Design an enzyme around this catalytic site. Structure first.
Site, PDB file in Angstrom:
ATOM      1  N   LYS A 545       0.877  -1.273   0.179  1.00 58.94           N
ATOM      2  CA  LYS A 545      -0.016   0.044   0.058  1.00 58.94           C
ATOM      3  C   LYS A 545       0.716   1.063  -0.091  1.00 58.94           C
ATOM      4  O   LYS A 545       2.000   0.997   0.113  1.00 58.94           O
ATOM      5  CB  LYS A 545      -0.939   0.058   1.310  1.00 58.94           C
ATOM      6  CG  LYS A 545      -0.157  -0.160   2.614  1.00 58.94           C
ATOM      7  CD  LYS A 545      -1.109  -0.346   4.060  1.00 58.94           C
ATOM      8  CE  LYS A 545      -1.782  -1.984   3.719  1.00 58.94           C
ATOM      9  NZ  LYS A 545      -3.387  -1.800   3.759  1.00 58.94           N
ATOM     10  N   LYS A 551      -0.807   4.277   8.257  1.00 61.95           N
ATOM     11  CA  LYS A 551      -1.158   2.802   7.639  1.00 61.95           C
ATOM     12  C   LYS A 551      -0.062   1.900   8.550  1.00 61.95           C
ATOM     13  O   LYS A 551      -0.033   0.956   8.668  1.00 61.95           O
ATOM     14  CB  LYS A 551      -0.805   2.586   6.145  1.00 61.95           C
ATOM     15  CG  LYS A 551      -1.739   3.126   5.311  1.00 61.95           C
ATOM     16  CD  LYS A 551      -1.413   3.235   3.892  1.00 61.95           C
ATOM     17  CE  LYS A 551      -2.557   3.920   3.047  1.00 61.95           C
ATOM     18  NZ  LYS A 551      -3.605   3.133   2.851  1.00 61.95           N
ATOM     19  N   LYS A 657      -8.822  -7.555  -1.662  1.00 59.88           N
ATOM     20  CA  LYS A 657      -8.174  -8.426  -2.805  1.00 59.88           C
ATOM     21  C   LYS A 657      -7.591  -9.716  -2.213  1.00 59.88           C
ATOM     22  O   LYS A 657      -7.448 -10.629  -2.698  1.00 59.88           O
ATOM     23  CB  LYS A 657      -6.937  -7.462  -3.385  1.00 59.88           C
ATOM     24  CG  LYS A 657      -7.553  -6.156  -4.128  1.00 59.88           C
ATOM     25  CD  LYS A 657      -6.419  -5.227  -4.618  1.00 59.88           C
ATOM     26  CE  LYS A 657      -6.989  -3.738  -4.923  1.00 59.88           C
ATOM     27  NZ  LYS A 657      -5.928  -3.012  -5.316  1.00 59.88           N
TER      28      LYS A 657
HETATM   29  O1  F55 Z   1      -6.551   6.929  -2.141  1.00 58.19           O
HETATM   30  C1  F55 Z   1      -6.998   7.886  -1.498  1.00 58.19           C
HETATM   31  N1  F55 Z   1      -6.653   9.083  -1.312  1.00 58.19           N
HETATM   32  C2  F55 Z   1      -6.091   9.684  -2.279  1.00 58.19           C
HETATM   33  O2  F55 Z   1      -5.166   8.877  -3.086  1.00 58.19           O
HETATM   34  C3  F55 Z   1      -5.574  11.032  -2.285  1.00 58.19           C
HETATM   35  C4  F55 Z   1      -5.131  11.881  -3.253  1.00 58.19           C
HETATM   36  C5  F55 Z   1      -5.159  13.283  -3.332  1.00 58.19           C
HETATM   37  C6  F55 Z   1      -5.418  13.894  -2.275  1.00 58.19           C
HETATM   38 CL1  F55 Z   1      -5.001  15.613  -2.119  1.00 58.19          CL
HETATM   39  C7  F55 Z   1      -5.640  13.283  -1.091  1.00 58.19           C
HETATM   40  C8  F55 Z   1      -5.650  11.816  -1.121  1.00 58.19           C
HETATM   41  N2  F55 Z   1      -7.908   7.493  -0.395  1.00 58.19           N
HETATM   42  C9  F55 Z   1      -7.955   6.300  -0.363  1.00 58.19           C
HETATM   43  O3  F55 Z   1      -9.695   5.697  -0.823  1.00 58.19           O
HETATM   44  C10 F55 Z   1      -9.927   4.400  -0.958  1.00 58.19           C
HETATM   45  C11 F55 Z   1     -11.185   4.296  -1.747  1.00 58.19           C
HETATM   46  O4  F55 Z   1     -12.250   4.634  -0.872  1.00 58.19           O
HETATM   47  C12 F55 Z   1     -10.008   3.851   0.612  1.00 58.19           C
HETATM   48  O5  F55 Z   1     -10.076   2.382   0.710  1.00 58.19           O
HETATM   49  C13 F55 Z   1      -9.081   4.281   1.714  1.00 58.19           C
HETATM   50  O6  F55 Z   1      -9.277   4.023   2.891  1.00 58.19           O
HETATM   51  C14 F55 Z   1      -8.447   5.863   1.269  1.00 58.19           C
HETATM   52  O7  F55 Z   1      -7.542   6.116   2.071  1.00 58.19           O
END
Ligand code: F55
Ligand code: F55
EC number: 2.4.1.1
Lengths: 813, 813
Positions: A545, A551, A657
């Site tokens: 991840k 995490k 997964k």
């Molecule tokens: O991946 C992300 N966030 C990003 O990649 C992100 C991208 C841009 C900004 Cl500015 C902040 C965060 N969040 C994740 O979303 C998943 C889908 O819902 C969740 O499973 C996970 O908990 C969450 O961290």
């Protein structure tokens, strides 16, 4: 070879071979004598692409004639990975192409490795959009994914001297056979300028124009002949842009400034940065998309019916400018009154939240919006005033609520809270796991929930069982199909039927056999591509991840060192052998995450070369973790590490997964882990650590890490080793930042879960010593993973948010 | 419809229709219901392209097996125009495609208009390279054109308020169906760095690397099944280029800096500008090309045989860095001794000069070469020392000769004379017309001719009769073929057979009929695309070429005003009606040329709206003159204006295009005009003005423009009209710069040829009054245009410079 990969009929194989030869000749302009393996990949890709075309044209004409409600999924990220194998799977072409290529003297798996990942995302949020597109096509929804065609996706990660180095992901270098440019649907997008007030309302004038050129990529449904579209926008300068020799030349070279909008994916997934280029990207996708939506709607005057024919889903706040942009178009251009436009907007838009961490939330400085989007700022101010008027009427005299709920945040710099904008302007707001959605209603969005309780929903995340089972783990898919048929691939709940095979000796042996085969293959992959050697009989302990403090890759690191120290203390004592694998990219500006990567490699450098350890413990950092790598490592895993601090991981999807692919889970009660344990039974999960409530108690009292250091001798030893330079003999103080953070400013309470974690890990090793019982628990996990299909997730979005019914019925071929 | 366009067989038409439908479906992903005219063009282009493929692969394999001497034509410009019709012509597919598209309900001529010009050149030099590629393929030579794939070619010209405006030529916007990217043959090019001296010679280290990625375009020979290659290089940043979030993002965006090398064609064809980006372009093409040449040579150790298998032709001095680059590779990398490397280099390279005007000659500041190419500067210094040693031995004591002949020019800034470099390092140096080649030996290269007389040659320019007769003027090609067969198309000397038809009443009528048809079509083109109305019965008086003082569009302007003033003086007197058409682009930084365009439009504004003039005189500026426009206007012309000051136009090629297409020529004895008049007979040309010798006499005495103003009342009137604001009533002094230049600093002696010019123009009008005699003189011109086929030119290069024999023999289909 295997049933689930389809038929290899004489007619089809012959036709595939001849079309392969046609593309090699006419498309690639090569013959067999000079053709490279890359040429062979492209010939196969074009051959498979041909089979999509008829279905693609006829799906889109079907939507025109039937005119169903259209779903528009807006995202700044689509983490697609490779397309070739996925297309073969969904078209039932895999065995036929395998045979066709075999008869030509080629290995298809070798050709598959040549395709570049479409790495147009950071992690979970971007991959969710990709799984969603697959499920929407499989469920026969008239759905469109809209995003940006980045020239450069997520950086390729190189490890040099144990440190992450970033290099440009030039994924389009050799061309993209899957996309089709549609320059005929090019649309103008406006920036800067000023607002002029006339008798007939506001006018946005003196703007700079950038063109948005669409590229369409087909999204095939699973064997239903549906092919939907992902439309990605590319930035183009107009031809009179910036238009002496020096002056003429410079004006042409300056076109790069406009076209930089679609150049590169922002890789920061930890901390929101208010950079102008990112704001431009966000408006660019929104402005072009909404024009496209409105055009399609008019080509069916009456905007009352707009929400009946259009749903817009906002993937986080990144496309939140859709709300004031829709208002801008309806009020300024279409001349609707404010109240009617607002009604249409709210009924059209819905918003999905993906985190509760405050540093990740978008809060745009007002001065940026003032310069770049002056009309949108005005509309936002008007939205805010009208919203706060409703709050004041519902909760009279509550002045602090008014400032808490405002879209405009006061302070040193005034900012717009984009999450507040999204809630006010959407008819539905959802979290991504039950616990997350509850936390939203109780904490950060509590005020909004009290005003409009009906708006708040849960939609637990899922993954597509096509890519994440059939494609990456055909051996497992086949042994399941042998028992229960093939219907589970688009109806994952059917896996519950495997519960009646938990005591079946043949099935137990088959499940264990598939895992061993996957581990051997991955062990071979490591030697061939990375020259690293592992024991295939060890427990494969995997944490993959993005690298984040929340995490807690650091907690994993502490356990690894504990195991190493225990071996060194009692060398002749038996321990269950482990291969500990950790992988993931760090955001380029995230110092602590880069230090964590260095720590992992430094531990490996000590552990992997200690003769006393032998092959009992190995620590490997998995370089360049991405979708195609996930497809390799996940089927090989025994133990899935899902160890975020309770209340920080909104859902997680990597967790699902692993569950589907026959790994057991060690995890906290966080995000979707809670629902996974509920489905499988707590007895069949390795749960440890603080619950959300325990974290809250510790925060009220005050978290003191020194207490744990003082009371746990094994933890003290590790910290002393880190401080004294045991893992960095030439730079004794290299890890001082890490120790300091752990001891004095750890937001995520690594020490607090350490004892319970190590204890739980012992229970894992105990079970692994009994292969039959290990495998029986695995079967209980696979059998109850059905809930976590993104088909289930999308069906819930469709019914509870979009107001459309899914369909499993075939379109004619 | 017409014989010369080939057969439309039932088998071929059926096959073309089905392959058209296949491309529309599978390639373009469209059906007939949503397909745009542009989609139809692309479907046809792909269909025709398919027919090239087999011949292309088998031509290149033929060269591998036969291993002939290879010819490499290096140019910074390839002015190709459109490809579709040319490909159909050379493959004998025109009538078949015409019928195929007709049966599909499409007009092929309409589809042809959709293709963008490949405008990768400025004018004559760039178009010469294009005609040469066509002739080399037609003569079966193993030839390769090497250049740069500019993203933006020559600017599109818009006329706004009578002024030239430039807009970007985004010719690749919709894609290029003709090119094939070859990323597998990507090569590194080095810049900057420093020179290190070891025991084993010099080393060029600490360089910046830019990648050169090739794109191949097929060049079909005329009906001989030969398909050669034009390879154009595109600049790409390496993936670790320039490799914090802000820092990471910027590093990716900064890749544009490297890729700017291939972004845009320099449009300055009047005045050499020592800009760094242009130097980078010149080295980029040379470095990538030479690596490619050497690789192909090794894949046939012994560099003695290099000149037996390789010829490099330098199109002007623009690729002159090939000379020290070849030395660099042979000495530094291959470890040959200097003397042997130099022998190989001289025997390999040959140089073509295109002008004697000093401001157009490349003289690079030493400080630029010092920073960008430090090793090349060292090699150039060594070449110079060794060359001047030979000069001193041949002409002892002649110190001024030594400074005159030096490659290094002293002064305020030290410069390298690239022409001197080319002469020293080539075994052959040629001018482009007999008079030009003689001027080189007598004036600017006199010293070099005295040292090495054997080096100097003439190769009179030519044009391809495929594009410039068969393609653009099928009606004329057909009436000729009716009389003498089809063999003349690849053996243009056969046109001499038409001399026996000069008194043939049927032929006279047919020639005049074809011209009238061409004029009607062009008159219709003007109304449809530009809304301008002309009398098709008037004499079409045409001057189309880049705008330059030396080309004397200004002299044409003076004649136009004279005609206007004469009409105004005697309105009821009969004059032969004329449509005066002037077209061409001005270099963006060339102020005087931009003023000349404004003058032409200003004259038109007065003349075209004077009721007394009626339809007796019209002045039109032809906007955006380019190859595709030339193909339209040239067949329509009656009078070709070739009126450069004697000794300034090296050859001209536009002149030859007009001669072939049935226009008579008014011209000075300059460039190829001299040989044209010699071939046709002076009686059949309208020759006027000073000869080179007369210009020389005037220069010795001193040119005084006031003398002409004082002695010619009609000239005085025009200058008074220009000064007083007759052609610019709202800006009375608009043309003050023009008047001042004409009166006080005219390098090109416009006034000196004025009287003879006007007199000669009267003789033209006299002949035009007698249509039968006009047409008989036309026939005498067409019949003697054979010498000016580029097939003749290339055969001479092949035999006298490259040491290869041309072949008209077919390769198997
Ligand atoms: O991946 C992300 N966030 C990003 O990649 C992100 C991208 C841009 C900004 Cl500015 C902040 C965060 N969040 C994740 O979303 C998943 C889908 O819902 C969740 O499973 C996970 O908990 C969450 O961290
Ligand atoms: O077109 C050019 N030159 C250019 O375009 C040019 C391009 C760049 C520079 Cl720096 C200078 C000149 N020269 C012409 O070459 C023709 C082909 O030989 C001749 O017919 C013509 O006389 C000459 O002017």
């Amino acid at each position: 070879q295997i049933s689930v990969r389809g038929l290899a009929g004489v007619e089809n194989v012959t036709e595939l071979k001849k079309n392969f030869n046609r593309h090699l000749h006419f498309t690639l302009v090569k013959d067999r004598n000079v053709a490279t393996p890359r040429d062979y990949y492209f010939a196969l890709a074009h051959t498979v692409r041909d089979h999509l075309v008829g279905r693609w044209i006829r799906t889109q004409q079907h939507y025109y004639e039937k005119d169903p409600k259209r779903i528009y999924y807006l995202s700044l990220e689509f983490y697609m990975g490779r397309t070739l194998q996925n297309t073969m799977v969904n078209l039932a072409l895999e065995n036929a192409c395998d045979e066709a290529t075999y008869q030509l003297g080629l290995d298809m798996e070798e050709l598959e490795e040549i395709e570049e990942d479409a790495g147009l995302g950071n992690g979970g949020l971007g991959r969710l959009a990709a799984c969603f597109l697959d499920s929407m096509a499989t469920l026969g929804l008239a759905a469109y994914g809209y995003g940006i065609r980045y020239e450069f996706g997520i950086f390729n990660q190189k490890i040099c001297g144990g440190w992450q180095m970033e290099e440009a992901d030039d994924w389009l270098r050799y061309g993209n056979p899957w996309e089709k440019a549609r320059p005929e649907f090019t649309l103008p997008v406006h920036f800067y300028g000023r607002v002029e007030h006339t008798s007939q309302g506001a006018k946005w004038v003196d703007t700079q124009v950038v063109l948005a050129m669409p590229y369409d990529t087909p999204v095939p449904g699973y064997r239903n002949n549906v092919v939907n579209t992902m439309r990605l926008w590319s930035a183009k300068a107009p031809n009179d842009f910036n238009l002496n020799v020096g002056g003429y030349i410079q004006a042409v070279l300056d076109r790069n400034l406009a076209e930089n909008i679609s150049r590169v994916l922002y890789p920061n997934d930890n901390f929101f940065e208010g950079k102008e280029l990112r704001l431009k990207q966000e408006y660019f996708v929104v402005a072009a998309t909404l024009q496209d939506i409105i055009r399609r709607f008019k080509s069916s005057t009456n905007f009352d019916a707009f929400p009946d024919k259009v749903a817009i889903q906002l993937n986080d706040t990144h496309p939140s400018l859709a709300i004031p942009e829709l208002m801008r178009v309806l009020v300024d251009l279409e001349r609707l009154d404010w109240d009617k436009a607002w009604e249409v907007t709210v009924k059209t838009c819905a918003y999905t939240n993906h985190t509760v961490l405050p540093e990740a939330l978008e809060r745009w400085p007002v001065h940026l919006l003032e310069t770049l989007l002056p009309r949108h700022l005005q509309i936002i101010y008007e939205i805010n005033q009208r919203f706060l008027n409703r709050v004041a009427a519902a909760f009279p005299g509550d002045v602090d609520r008014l400032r808490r709920m405002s879209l405009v945040e006061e302070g040193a710099v005034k900012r717009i809270n984009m999450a507040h904008l999204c809630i006010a302007g959407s008819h539905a707001v959802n979290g991504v796991a039950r616990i997350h959605s509850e936390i939203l209603k109780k904490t950060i969005f509590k005020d909004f929930y009290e005003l409009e309780p009906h708006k708040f929903q849960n939609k637990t995340n899922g993954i597509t069982p096509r890519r994440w089972l059939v494609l990456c783990n055909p051996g497992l898919a086949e042994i399941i199909a042998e028992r229960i048929g093939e219907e589970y691939i688009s109806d994952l709940d059917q896996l519950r039927k495997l519960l009646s095979y938990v005591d079946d000796e043949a099935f137990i042996r088959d499940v264990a056999k598939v895992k061993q085969e996957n581990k051997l293959k991955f062990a071979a992959y490591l030697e061939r591509e990375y020259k690293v050697h592992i024991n295939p009989n060890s427990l494969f302990d995997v944490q993959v991840k993005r690298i984040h403090e929340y995490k807690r890759q650091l907690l994993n690191c502490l356990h690894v060192i504990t195991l190493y120290n225990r071996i060194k203390k009692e060398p002749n004592k038996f321990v269950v052998p482990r291969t500990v694998m950790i992988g993931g990219k760090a955001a380029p500006g995230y110092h602590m995450a880069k230090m964590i990567i260095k720590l992992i490699t430094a531990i490996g450098d000590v552990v992997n070369h200690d003769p006393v350890v032998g092959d009992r413990l190995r620590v490997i950092f998995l370089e360049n973790y991405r979708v195609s790598l996930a497809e390799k490592v996940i089927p090989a895993a025994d133990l899935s590490e899902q160890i975020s601090t309770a209340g920080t991981e909104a859902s997680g999807t990597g967790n699902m997964k692993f569950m589907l692919n026959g790994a057991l889970t060690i995890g906290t009660m966080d995000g979707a882990n809670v629902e996974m344990a509920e489905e499988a039974g707590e007895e069949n999960f390795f749960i440890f650590g603080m619950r959300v409530e325990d974290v809250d108690r510790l925060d009220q009292r005050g978290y003191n890490a020194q207490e744990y250091y003082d009371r746990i001798p094994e933890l003290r030893q590790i910290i002393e080793q880190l401080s004294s330079g045991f893992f960095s003999p030439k730079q004794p103080d290299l890890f001082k930042d890490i120790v300091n953070m752990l001891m004095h400013h750890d937001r995520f309470k690594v020490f607090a879960d350490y004892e319970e974690y190590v204890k739980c890990q012992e229970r894992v090793s105990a079970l692994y010593k009994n292969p039959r019982e290990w495998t029986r628990m695995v079967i209980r996990n696979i059998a109850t993973s059905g809930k976590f299909s993104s088909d289930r997730t999308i069906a819930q979005y469709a019914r509870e948010i979009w107001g459309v019914e899914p369909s499993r019925q075939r379109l004619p071929a």
